[PDB]
């Protein structure tokens, strides 16, 4: 069967038995920066498998009236072992990513999830002409949560699901690399993002590269007696990461 997939990176391995098709990127596979498109002059640090491995983020709980969660991924991996340590000592860095989102239920359950990677998802503010705090955009490994109604918390992101924070129709987010976790048949949420930017290397802290969003379009629904606690676990790997411009320890 093609429902089974093993993914091996570093000293970490993910096995899935209800994959559908491992979704992977814009057609492009991640690779190291060539020296014909390069800008910086000193020797890069291709560190090892010590960064190119899976890291598990926190789990979010999918209830009957949950709306959606999001992450910012160069910033979410900022305390995840030696990867984050390289972020704190180098000025420029660069990596693709293997995102694998897991979630499981039983056959008596129903509900459908959308898992999108959105490049440059510049969020809009809840009150219009007002600053946004960094803790409301990216909270590290901890997810920020959309709402159903419009939000009006001060110095916060406008969080409605039907506008996705950015101000578009949420059914139009299937233009980005995505999958669905239909609980009837899926768990295979890969998106192997390449490096996507407008410059050959970039700073990990000053720039957010993309945004993972997990939005349930068909909400979770079950009969009385089934397991009511259904977690969603997000695991993320850097691929072909390299670092440049070593100096003192950075901005925590």
């Amino acid at each position: 069967s093609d429902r089974v997939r093993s993914i091996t990176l570093g000293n970490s391995t993910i096995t899935t038995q209800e994959s559908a098709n491992v979704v992977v990127g814009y057609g492009v596979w991640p690779d190291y920066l060539s020296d014909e498109e390069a800008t910086a002059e000193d020797q890069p640090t291709q560190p090892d498998v010590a960064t190119c491995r899976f890291y598990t983020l926190d789990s979010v709980s999918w209830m009957k009236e949950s709306q959606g969660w999001w992450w910012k991924f160069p910033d979410a991996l900022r305390d995840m072992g030696l990867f984050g340590q390289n972020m704190q000592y180098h000025y420029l860095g660069r990596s693709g990513y293997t995102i694998h989102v897991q979630c499981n239920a039983s056959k008596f359950h129903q509900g459908c999830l959308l898992v999108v990677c959105v490049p440059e998802a510049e969020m809009g503010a809840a009150n219009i002409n007002e600053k946004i705090n960094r803790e409301h955009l990216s909270n590290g490994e901890v997810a920020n949560t959309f709402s159903g109604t419009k939000s009006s918390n001060t110095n916060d992101v406008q969080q409605a699901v039907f506008n996705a924070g950015m101000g578009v129709a949420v059914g139009n987010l299937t233009i980005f690399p995505h999958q669905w976790i239909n609980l009837r048949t899926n768990n295979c949420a890969t998106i192997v993002m390449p490096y996507i930017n407008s410059v050959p290397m970039d700073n990990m802290f000053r720039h957010y590269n993309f945004t993972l969003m997990i939005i349930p379009f068909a909400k979770l629904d079950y009969a009385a007696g089934s397991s009511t606690y259904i977690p969603i676990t997000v695991t993320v790997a850097p691929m072909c990461a390299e670092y440049n411009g070593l100096r003192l320890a950075g901005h925590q």
Binding site: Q110, C112, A218, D221, A223
Partner: protein, 59 residues
Amino acid sequence: SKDIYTDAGFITCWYQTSIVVPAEVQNQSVILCFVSACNDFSVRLLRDSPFVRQTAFYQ
């Protein structure tokens, strides 16, 4: 846009039989509908979209 000369038809979906579930399974479920275009789709006359609206300059 809408003219009567180029009417295009109707799209309907019918309960044909039923939804059949066992005991202790939720009856009410949800269909999601997608739309896209084929490999023979084409558009012709550049106009401005009827959805952009501006009153004053954004500053």
